[PDB]
Design a protein around this ligand. Structure first.
Ligand SMILES: [Zn+2]
Lengths: 38, 142, 57, 97, 76, 137
RNA sequence: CCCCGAAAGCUAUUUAGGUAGCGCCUCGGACGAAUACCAUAGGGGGUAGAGCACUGUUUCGGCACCGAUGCAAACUCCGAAUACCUAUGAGUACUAUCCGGGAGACAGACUGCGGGUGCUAACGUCCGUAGUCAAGAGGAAAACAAUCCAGACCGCCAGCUAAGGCCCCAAAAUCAUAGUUAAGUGGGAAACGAUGUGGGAAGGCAUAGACAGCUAUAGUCGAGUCGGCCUGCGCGGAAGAUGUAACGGG
């Protein structure tokens, strides 16, 4: 999990979602692309 | 000396009962404080207690809006170093419903001996029963 | 041919020429009303202190 | 014919700095029309219509028509002013053709 | 330590009498380092380019001549 | 590090930065350009960094026009020095930026590559920018 | 007890926390429109802005010059608003000026505007200009010389308003009509990031059937869908020491 002020899609398998007022990125292929804005 | 002050020996206190089911906390508290202080009587005097007795029933059914059920915080300090204690509304309403009303009405009454005397006239009960049948309270819808 | 001017605000902190314009029109206090001739010379003083007078034209 | 702009007269009480700023706050554009044998005429234009016309390239080389009610003028674009930072058109000149 | 910190005393130059005013003979009209204004009728020039009136009258400024020089004169 | 070859004076007053840029706000040399939207100061190092980024991205396939030059010197005190005792020493050179001023122009590339290079460059600058293209008027 | 009422500036000083002349206060005498505010008329300027004609400086081409393109406290082909000087004039006002008796003061402060210096730091320092304090009480900003409103002769258990306000502490609307926000945002903070929601101007494809999903572009279905620009209000970025402690509290 990466925690940064800027979160973006990396590949075509990343999806940007919103949970409980937090913007996250979840990737279907590689777990290392997982991100959380913070 | 033509404007007269109310005489404490001539003040009549009346008994009312209020049901708190589904009411907003602060908007009920303002009216309760008004009637405790006596602002609704034409003989109102700032240095004399002229208010009425208010019984509150179903105290654990009071409501708050937004996210205040989980996010509103209650603090106290035991005067030992590091002694700050914290709770929230939803635990406090389950545990001690009367202290919520005590805090809310105490914040709106004056701070002094007269205010301490005024707040003695409010009786808060969690359930739907009160032990003051002998005083024959009247139903008040505020 | 004559107009009525009423002072509506205080003149204590104003500029010196503005105070002198009020004194030259004859206004002495808040709520004072005077009646003056309708001439360009009077109109200049009125227009300079427009923001604290009321004109009944 | 192909390019037509509906316009309304801009009067003396609508001319000036504050008046022009109020017009632009109402989303309008001031314009002037001058040319041979007639006095200048001041008019007001629609911002969206002007932007749509400026997007096309033939607008700058073809005779355009400005209609203020019954009065009709045939003119060419002569000069345009834009805001330095936002690029919004601010004033237009039209030379009679 | 700075090498600056000097300046000279003020000299009080400029126009002393403006257009439309009345003068008497001897009144100084302009103080000037160079000849920014030139002497017209009834106006004399001193050794330091000062312009003064040589007769009573009214001061008047103008622009005249083939070089566009500024002139001041006195009308009696 | 752009800097004038010689100057008439060494130290200049601070001044104030006011107004808009009515001059230098039109694409003249190239076809696409980047321009500032708010005011500020631009240093020679910032100019060099943005130029290097643009040139590296476009791989020197077109021509880059730089329209800002840092002709204003800025002084500083030597540190641990008290107030007074003269003006400081020149440290670096800046250019004053007003809203609407065009910084860089590019000639001879595709718009997608020019925009990607401009986006790369805009991250090195201390003020907001925007992209413009040439127009008849 | 009654009346008026400053200054913390300039110049010089073995002078810098002293003093002297002038400026500012007061009292007496002389003399009244010679004074000021505003209108009209006359007048010089080189600042703001702007520009490249000079002095410097700047980028790209062509051949120091030529074509485009920028910059300047000690550059100017230009050039205001205000300020300043003079004359005439209505109205309002104990105004102006001259001669004498007595002084105090010559450590200022903050706020706004134009600037130098400093880091476009400081409740920093040095100038110009206006207001307040100094020497000024009352109401508002929780408390708060210098901010906002307003200038206290004395008395009244009368009335109208200013700034600021009208749920309770605590005087007055739980007033009325339309919208926005879900963050207790309101009631601290940036670059940047994001299908959060409201509004606006255009564009692409589409019931000879559009987007997604699914079967190997066709094909099952049955109306919208797609990607940008401008804009209102919100979200993250956001860590500190005694006690909630960044709406005065409820
Ligand atoms: Zn991925």
């Amino acid at each position: 999990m990466k925690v940064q002020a800027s979160v973006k899609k990396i590949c075509g398998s990343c999806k940007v979602i919103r949970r409980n007022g937090v913007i996250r990125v979840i990737c279907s292929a590689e777990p290392r692309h997982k991100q959380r804005q913070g | 000396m033509k404007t007269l002050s109310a005489k404490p020996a001539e003040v009549q206190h009346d008994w009312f009962v209020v049901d708190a089911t589904g009411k907003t906390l602060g908007r009920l508290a303002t009216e309760i404080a008004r009637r405790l202080r006596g602002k609704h009587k034409t003989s109102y005097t700032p240095h004399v207690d002229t208010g009425d007795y208010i019984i509150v029933i179903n105290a654990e059914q009071v409501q708050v809006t937004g996210n205040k059920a989980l996010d509103k915080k209650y603090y106290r300090h035991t005067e030992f170093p590091g002694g700050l204690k914290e709770t929230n509304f939803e635990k406090l309403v389950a545990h001690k419903p009367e202290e919520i009303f005590e805090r809310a009405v105490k914040g709106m009454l004056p701070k002094g001996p007269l205010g301490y005397a005024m707040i003695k006239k409010m009786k808060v009960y969690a359930g739907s029963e009160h032990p003051h049948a002998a005083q024959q309270p009247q139903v008040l819808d505020i | 041919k004559t107009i009525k001017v009423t002072q509506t605000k205080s003149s204590s902190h104003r500029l010196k020429n503005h105070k002198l314009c009020l004194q030259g029109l004859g206004l002495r206090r808040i709520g004072h009303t005077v009646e003056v001739q309708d001439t360009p010379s009077n109109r200049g003083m009125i227009n300079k202190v427009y923001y604290m007078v009321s004109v009944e034209e | 014919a192909n390019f037509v702009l509906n316009a309304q007269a801009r009067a003396e009480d609508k001319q000036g700095k504050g008046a022009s700023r109020r017009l632009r706050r109402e989303s309008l554009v001031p314009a002037i029309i001058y040319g041979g044998n007639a006095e200048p005429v001041a008019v007001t234009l629609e911002l969206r219509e002007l932007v749509k016309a400026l997007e096309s390239n033939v607008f700058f080389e073809e005779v355009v028509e400005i209609k203020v009610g019954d009065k009709v003028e045939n003119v060419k674009i002569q000069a345009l002013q834009r805001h330095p930072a936002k690029n919004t058109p601010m004033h237009a000149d039209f030379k009679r053709a | 330590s700075t090498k600056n910190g000097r300046d000279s005393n003020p000299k009080m130059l400029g126009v002393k009498v403006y257009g439309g005013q009345t003068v008497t003979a001897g009144n100084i009209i302009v103080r000037q380092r160079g000849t920014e204004f030139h002497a017209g009728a009834n106006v004399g020039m001193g050794r330091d380019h000062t312009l003064f009136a040589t007769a009573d009258g009214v001061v008047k400024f103008e622009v005249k001549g083939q070089f566009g020089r500024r002139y001041v004169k006195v009308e009696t | 590090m752009l800097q004038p070859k010689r100057t008439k004076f060494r130290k200049v007053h601070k001044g104030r930065n006011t107004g808009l840029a009515h001059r230098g706000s039109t694409v003249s040399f190239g076809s696409i350009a980047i321009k500032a939207t708010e005011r500020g100061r631009m240093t020679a190092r910032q100019i060099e960094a943005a130029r290097r980024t643009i040139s590296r991205r476009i791989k020197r396939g077109g021509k880059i026009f730089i329209r800002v030059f840092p002709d204003k010197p800025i002084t500083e005190k030597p540190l641990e020095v008290r107030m007074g005792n003269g003006k400081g020493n020149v440290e670096y050179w800046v250019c004053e930026i007003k809203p609407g001023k065009i910084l860089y122009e590019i000639e001879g590339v595709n718009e997608d590559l020019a925009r990607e290079a401009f986006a790369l460059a805009a991250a090195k600058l201390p003020f907001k920018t925007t992209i413009v293209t040439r127009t008849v008027m």
